[PDB]
From a paper:
Here, we show that fluorinated amino acids can be easily incorporated in proteins expressed in human cells by employing a medium switch strategy. This straightforward approach allows the incorporation of different fluorinated amino acids in the protein of interest, reaching fluorination efficiencies up to 60%, as confirmed by mass spectrometry and X-ray crystallography. We tested this approach on a set of soluble human proteins: α-synuclein (αSYN), copper-zinc superoxide dismutase (SOD1), carbonic anhydrase isoform 2 (CA2), the deglycase DJ-1, the N-terminal domain of heat shock protein 90 (Nt-HSP90), and the SOD-like domain of the copper chaperone for SOD (CCS-D2). We apply the approach to observe the interaction between an intracellular target, carbonic anhydrase 2, and its inhibitors, and to investigate how the formation of a complex between superoxide dismutase 1 and its chaperone CCS modulates the interaction of the chaperone subunit with the cellular environment.
To evaluate the impact of FAA incorporation on protein structure, which could negatively affect the significance of 19F NMR data for drug screening applications, we determined the structure of 6FW-CA2 by X-ray crystallography. The protein was purified from human cells after a 24 h ST expression protocol and subsequently crystallized. The 3D structure of 6FW-CA2 is perfectly superimposable with those already deposited in the PDB and shares the same space group and cell parameters (backbone RMSD 0.21 Å). The presence of fluorine atoms in all seven tryptophan residues is evident in the electron density. The occupancy values of the fluorine atoms computed during refinement ranged from 0.4 to 0.6, in good agreement with the percentage of 6FW incorporation obtained by MS. Therefore, the incorporation of 6FW at up to seven positions in the CA2 polypeptide does not significantly affect any structural features of the protein, making 6FW-CA2 amenable for protein–ligand interaction studies by 19F in-cell NMR. As a result, 6FW incorporation efficiency after an 8 h ST was the highest for both SOD1 and CA2 (>60% from MS), but the protein yields were the lowest among the three selected ST conditions. In contrast, a 24 h ST gave rise to the highest yields, even though the incorporation efficiency was <50% for both proteins. Remarkably, 6FW incorporation allowed distinguishing CA2 bound to different ligands, as the signal at −119.3 ppm either shifted to −119.0 ppm, broadened, or split into three separated peaks when 6FW-CA2 interacted with ETZ, MZA, or AAZ, respectively. In the case of CA2, the high number of tryptophan residues allowed probing several positions on the protein structure, some of which were clearly perturbed upon binding.
Numbering used by the authors: 3 to 125, 127 to 261
The structure:
Amino acid sequence: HHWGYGKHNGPEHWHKDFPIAKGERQSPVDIDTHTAKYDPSLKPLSVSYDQATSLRILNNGHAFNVEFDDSQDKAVLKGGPLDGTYRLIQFHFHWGSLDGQGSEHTVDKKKYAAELHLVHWNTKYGDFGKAVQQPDGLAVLGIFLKVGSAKPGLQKVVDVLDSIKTKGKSADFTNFDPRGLLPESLDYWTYPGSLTTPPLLECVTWIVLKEPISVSSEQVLKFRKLNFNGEGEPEELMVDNWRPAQPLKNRQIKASFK
Ligand SMILES: [Zn+2]
């Protein structure tokens, strides 16, 4: 009876195995755009992905992760609210069963069709495993997806999904360039929070871009053909793999922009 997103194991149940689910800096959260204060000391975000090396795409039973070689300083996030340099380890998405839901963060209670998470770890902790044990161990860049025009840079991801339909399947996935997933603007909101899946560790500086990217209905439809189950098990479509907004608890959300 492992955690997931169903009626009997979904986000409302997580606190039983992961008591930090009711902690002081849980994610995601609703971004109240009227109370997020502009902070002119926040720096431009620096996203250096030109040397990114993707290796593999994996269905882990909760999402698909596109994984990167993080054994050298190749694809780093820095600047913004961060001190130091954070190395990209993987990205993944959360999405809905319908276009009207799917994002984890919300913006004045608005839910987007999906949300992309580019996960980075603080190089001063040596690796991802040690970083998640630190309050500033991770920097996660969150990007909202709305349904409209296709995102051409997403199409190589969408097209390999039939090869990792079920939990546990992986596929070679080299030379994918994540710069094809970024909006024009790097204006962002930022706040201290957590992983949004178990173990829900409170190790993340969240950086959520104000500008969503557009993906086509056909692109998000193919996300929804994935499976939570493993091969040869009853088919359960991987949809609504999103945790809802959690209490802000007096944390302040800061805006990079006026
Ligand atoms: Zn995520």
